Design a protein around this ligand. Sequence first.
Ligand SMILES: *[C@@H]1O[C@H](CO[C@@H]2O[C@@H](C)[C@@H](O)[C@@H](O)[C@@H]2O)[C@@H](O[C@@H]2O[C@H](CO)[C@@H](O[C@@H]3O[C@H](CO[C@H]4O[C@H](CO)[C@@H](O)[C@H](O)[C@@H]4O[C@@H]4O[C@H](CO)[C@@H](O)[C@H](O)[C@H]4NC(C)=O)[C@@H](O)[C@H](O[C@H]4O[C@H](CO)[C@@H](O)[C@H](O)[C@@H]4O[C@@H]4O[C@H](CO)[C@@H](O)[C@H](O)[C@H]4NC(C)=O)[C@@H]3O)[C@H](O)[C@H]2NC(C)=O)[C@H](O)[C@H]1NC(C)=O
Ligand SMILES: *[C@@H]1O[C@H](CO[C@@H]2O[C@@H](C)[C@@H](O)[C@@H](O)[C@@H]2O)[C@@H](O[C@@H]2O[C@H](CO)[C@@H](O[C@@H]3O[C@H](CO[C@H]4O[C@H](CO)[C@@H](O)[C@H](O)[C@@H]4O[C@@H]4O[C@H](CO)[C@@H](O)[C@H](O)[C@H]4NC(C)=O)[C@@H](O)[C@H](O[C@H]4O[C@H](CO)[C@@H](O)[C@H](O)[C@@H]4O[C@@H]4O[C@H](CO)[C@@H](O)[C@H](O)[C@H]4NC(C)=O)[C@@H]3O)[C@H](O)[C@H]2NC(C)=O)[C@H](O)[C@H]1NC(C)=O
Ligand SMILES: *[C@@H]1O[C@H](CO)[C@@H](O[C@@H]2O[C@H](CO)[C@@H](O[C@@H]3O[C@H](CO[C@H]4O[C@H](CO)[C@@H](O)[C@H](O)[C@@H]4O[C@@H]4O[C@H](CO)[C@@H](O)[C@H](O)[C@H]4NC(C)=O)[C@@H](O)[C@H](O[C@H]4O[C@H](CO)[C@@H](O)[C@H](O)[C@@H]4O)[C@@H]3O)[C@H](O)[C@H]2NC(C)=O)[C@H](O)[C@H]1NC(C)=O
Ligand code: CAC
Ligand code: CAC
Lengths: 95, 95, 216, 209, 214, 181
Amino acid sequence: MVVKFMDVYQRSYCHPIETLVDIFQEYPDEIEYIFKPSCVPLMRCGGCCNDEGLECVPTEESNITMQIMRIKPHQGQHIGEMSFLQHNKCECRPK
Amino acid sequence: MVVKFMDVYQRSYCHPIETLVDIFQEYPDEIEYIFKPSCVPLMRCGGCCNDEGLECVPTEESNITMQIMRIKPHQGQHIGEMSFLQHNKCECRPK
Amino acid sequence: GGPSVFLFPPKPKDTLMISRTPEVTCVVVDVSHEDPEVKFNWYVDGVEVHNAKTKPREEQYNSTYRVVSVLTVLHQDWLNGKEYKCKVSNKALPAPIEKTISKAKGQPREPQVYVYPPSRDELRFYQVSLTCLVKGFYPSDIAVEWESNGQPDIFPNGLNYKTTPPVLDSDGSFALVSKLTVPYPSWLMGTRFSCSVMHEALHNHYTQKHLEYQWP
Amino acid sequence: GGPSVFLFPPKPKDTLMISRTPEVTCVVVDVSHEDPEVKFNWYVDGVEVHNAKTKPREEQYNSTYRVVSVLTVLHQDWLNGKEYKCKVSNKALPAPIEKTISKAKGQPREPQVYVLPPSRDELTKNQVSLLCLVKGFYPSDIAVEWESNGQPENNYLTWPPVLDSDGSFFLYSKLTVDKSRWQQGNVFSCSVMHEALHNHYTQKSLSLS
Amino acid sequence: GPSVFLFPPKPKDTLMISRTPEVTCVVVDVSHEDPEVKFNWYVDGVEVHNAKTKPREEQYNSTYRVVSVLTVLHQDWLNGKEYKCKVSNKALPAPIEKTISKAKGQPREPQVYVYPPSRDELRFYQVSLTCLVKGFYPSDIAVEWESNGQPDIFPNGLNYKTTPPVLDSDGSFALVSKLTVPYPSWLMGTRFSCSVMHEALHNHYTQKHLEYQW
Amino acid sequence: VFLFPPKPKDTLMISRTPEVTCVVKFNWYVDGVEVHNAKTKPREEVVSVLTVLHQDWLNGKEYKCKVSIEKTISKAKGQPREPQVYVLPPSRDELTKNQVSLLCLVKGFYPSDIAVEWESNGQPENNYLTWPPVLDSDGSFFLYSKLTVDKSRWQQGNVFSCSVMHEALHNHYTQKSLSLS
Ligand SMILES: *[C@@H]1O[C@H](CO[C@@H]2O[C@@H](C)[C@@H](O)[C@@H](O)[C@@H]2O)[C@@H](O[C@@H]2O[C@H](CO)[C@@H](O[C@@H]3O[C@H](CO[C@H]4O[C@H](CO)[C@@H](O)[C@H](O)[C@@H]4O[C@@H]4O[C@H](CO)[C@@H](O)[C@H](O)[C@H]4NC(C)=O)[C@@H](O)[C@H](O[C@H]4O[C@H](CO)[C@@H](O)[C@H](O)[C@@H]4O[C@@H]4O[C@H](CO)[C@@H](O)[C@H](O)[C@H]4NC(C)=O)[C@@H]3O)[C@H](O)[C@H]2NC(C)=O)[C@H](O)[C@H]1NC(C)=O
Ligand SMILES: *[C@@H]1O[C@H](CO[C@@H]2O[C@@H](C)[C@@H](O)[C@@H](O)[C@@H]2O)[C@@H](O[C@@H]2O[C@H](CO)[C@@H](O[C@@H]3O[C@H](CO[C@H]4O[C@H](CO)[C@@H](O)[C@H](O)[C@@H]4O[C@@H]4O[C@H](CO)[C@@H](O)[C@H](O)[C@H]4NC(C)=O)[C@@H](O)[C@H](O[C@H]4O[C@H](CO)[C@@H](O)[C@H](O)[C@@H]4O[C@@H]4O[C@H](CO)[C@@H](O)[C@H](O)[C@H]4NC(C)=O)[C@@H]3O)[C@H](O)[C@H]2NC(C)=O)[C@H](O)[C@H]1NC(C)=O
Ligand SMILES: *[C@@H]1O[C@H](CO)[C@@H](O[C@@H]2O[C@H](CO)[C@@H](O[C@@H]3O[C@H](CO[C@H]4O[C@H](CO)[C@@H](O)[C@H](O)[C@@H]4O[C@@H]4O[C@H](CO)[C@@H](O)[C@H](O)[C@H]4NC(C)=O)[C@@H](O)[C@H](O[C@H]4O[C@H](CO)[C@@H](O)[C@H](O)[C@@H]4O)[C@@H]3O)[C@H](O)[C@H]2NC(C)=O)[C@H](O)[C@H]1NC(C)=O
Ligand SMILES: C[As](C)(=O)[O-]
Ligand SMILES: C[As](C)(=O)[O-]
């Protein structure tokens, strides 16, 4: 079938979407470790706006804590809590 | 609360996840046009694997047609049916 | 204490479309369970009439009934300024309550209808606003609706519009604004939105203004 | 029954501009010529205040009196939700009547202001209608004005707030101007004042261009 | 003619004193014209009058299914006593007789070994834990898996399958049990245990544990 | 009569002869068509062996044996699945003994027809035990094969290989090897 223009534009419009974020990029200081899973699912703002002069940005954020396997080469490894920043509201605003 | 390791790891594991893709990434040569929406939501392989020697790749693919509006700046616009590649099945495979 | 009465006029759309049936509604509140019977007597320009429609009493959360009576009226009767009186008799009332209602007297005046597209500043939101200005009309009885040529695929739940109640303008006429909220892509894709106004001072009691996206 | 009491809140512009004075007004009607005495007691969150001012008694046409008491309040107190109580005592009443008022509770929402130029259809008339759309605000307390080249305008109509589908409010304000003034290129401005606005004030302008 | 099948008690019932071992005598292919069935139970030749017979069962193939259950003492079965079920019906001229007893032969203690998944299996989300049980005699045995992730990680139970015991080259029996679990439950350090019940084991019971090793 | 299918290894290798065994005058009918290429072995104080061709048995043809009673057999129907093959080295506890058990896990295959063998250094290892397939929870089959070897042979570093043959494997064959360390 075809996805009607109405449905396409709505689903792609600026909103919080589940996104897989690499842990190193959220904890670049903890580069001495290896994480399992190396990627975590986080609600992040994504999608397109009604004009090119606007950008999808978060308006209210929140923290979420997840259990991650932290591995240090040849020293040890354990499940540890790690906090991550998630987006609860998004809005299109000028660049 | 804290997200249990079971839940984190399962949701992070190689699977087809709704992903917002820039139309230009799929049509890099259609330069003379503006697209609305500029991005489309496509099922694409993403997530982490059980071993660093493995990668998440698609094993079953298909196309999906969407109504996208095409704009030529100083001429006009029109709604057309563009097709995109989506990933139906994903598996961890040796590199 | 005692029960109270409220007499409501017909819907403007009903008085202006021959297909529809206008009706005057007499509502009685604060009716006790001990004495729940209410007798309605209707009069039109003084003469009594017996085509009244009785509604089943309605229990309210405050342990009291809401008794209603509905009188259907002729379109020309209401528009010609006839007076409708509801007389209410209840065991808890030492004397029956009377209430009258009639169309506002005054030279009818034709509404002007103007439609405005969204402001460019509003594009920062997914939903955009279409505006319909209706001014210069008398009496205040008027009906305003929105339509679209969009198939039910576009608006399966209908259109989300709200309208200000009419208020008096500087020239003795009434004026209002109706705001229609629609998703931007429905405006962008060329959907044609229409503001339909029904008023007695209009030819055929009906007019319409249309609105759609414009390209340079 | 007997005398009736109605308690009115401050004007939105008075609570928002520090230069102005917000006041709560306690109006007593249906006062008889037999028992014309009226005493007021004012309370802020239950604590009694004594800065109220009673206006001179006003005889009405239905052979009753209208007694008014005005209480000056603090801007922050009203905006912080403090409760203002008027207690009215009159020999014709079994017990005193008590009325309370306070700002509406709930998360305030910032309004967005949009100015709409006149439609092409109306450009055949001697006067055109400029519209100011204010939507998405809470609470409903708000003030709207028009200006042009500095001088304020006078011939404009503002409708009261309407409850929108998402629980916020919206309104329109209509400015009537001579078509020549519009087509001459003058700049017209819509000024809005609301709690949730930066400095309680925003302004949007439009002109033919 | 109707057929008879005589089944022995569950190995788990004979090894736990808290349980009740029972020998079951099933009869199939019972016609509607001659539905009656008689049961005569014998142990060491002596007849017993303690079996409880369960009511017939209409089967999907229009035949009746009659079952009689006989309780036994733990010490009786483990000592090798012989049990016989005799069936009588008009559809068979001679009453069928079946016999069951515990296998004779020197009992042998099972050896239990556990294995983590092969590295090549990690390309799947579900991985396999293996428990080898060999060297035991007689074949009567019970094998189950357990985890300290029960019930909080595995509320619905554990997903494992076990081969029927087969005679190995040394005259003893051997089997393999495969437990399937999600990889992260294995990675996160959850303990998994292969539990074996057999008459030649101390307290009729032993356990081997498996954990992720770094 | 007991009509046994051919051996999985015979049906998968061209060099070998797959044959149905009509264990008890014989008459064979392939999907109806009668054949007389059958044979009858010496009566043992009887067996009729029907030579079949590889592709026909693997393509699901039906073979009836009618002796003078009719019984038929054919390959199992259903979406075939490729077997996964894993080899597990001896457990630490077993290394305290003079013999050690090498395990070959084969899971996720359909139909159940399969053949497993062991070998080392180019010579076939014979002291192994293979359990019949077990129906797994996902509708496919799995099995284990256990090779027993003297611990000395393992500790010396010799490589042992599990060979598996199944219709759904590329070339009908795959191999996994295993050694000390
Ligand atoms: C026991 O409970 C019941 C019901 O429960 C309650 O119902 C709702 C409304 C909430 O209160 C809930 O919290 C609660 O569950 C109580 O019944 C109520 O009683 C009061 C009186 O005490 C009535 O007030 C009047 O309301 C009318 C408006 O009524 C319309 O709009 C309502 C909006 O909610 C709606 O509920 C009504 O059903 C009615 O709706 C209309 O119905 C008609 C007919 O079906 C239909 O054609 C219309 O389309 C439809 N419209 C809408 C929008 O729904 C209001 O007009 C009255 O105001 C006049 O009178 C007042 C007192 O005299 C005065 O203060 C006003 O200023 C105004 O004054 C002037 O009066 C003169 C003549 O008197 C008149 O000529 C003038 O025009 C008028 N105005 C001016 C400027 O001069 C009045 O306020 C409620 O309607 C009624 N509710 C219902 C559902 O019936 C009951 O009171 C409770 N009992 C006790 C002891 O507590
Ligand atoms: C004798 O005469 C006097 C006065 O003289 C008369 O004045 C005029 C009106 C002409 O008729 C003259 O010819 C005549 O001489 C009568 O006094 C009147 O009494 C009625 C009640 O009987 C009062 O009605 C109330 O009015 C308020 C609104 O009042 C403001 O607006 C009026 C115009 O719209 C204006 O006239 C008033 O002066 C007042 O003006 C405000 O003043 C303040 C400070 O002074 C200022 O800050 C404001 O800016 C200003 N506003 C404006 C617009 O100018 C109305 O809100 C009331 O409605 C509530 O009460 C009703 C009945 O209780 C109820 O039905 C309503 O639903 C509503 O109450 C709801 O429910 C509860 C109440 O139970 C309430 O708590 C809720 O909040 C509310 N719900 C919602 C959703 O809101 C009410 O209708 C008149 O104001 C009053 N007139 C004056 C001038 O004081 C007297 O009645 C006569 N005697 C007899 C026997 O008839
Ligand atoms: C009408 O439908 C009936 C129901 O479908 C048919 O009944 C079936 O008839 C066939 C033969 O006609 C019998 O086949 C025998 O099965 C024995 C094993 O039975 C166990 O397993 C089956 C299937 O797994 C199960 O349904 C049975 O109920 C039984 O389960 C066991 O029950 C005991 C009793 O409590 C319990 O303790 C066990 O835990 C439990 N186990 C399991 C796994 O469930 C076989 O052992 C028989 O083997 C024969 O061949 C052997 C090798 O030569 C030989 O050594 C044996 O001596 C024996 O001769 C045999 O294959 C089915 O059991 C029977 N089903 C039931 C439920 O009774 C009926 O035949 C049919 N009538 C028609 C078509 O005319
Ligand atoms: C790009 As066209 C609408 O001219 O086919
Ligand atoms: C949803 As609200 C009460 O903050 O307008």
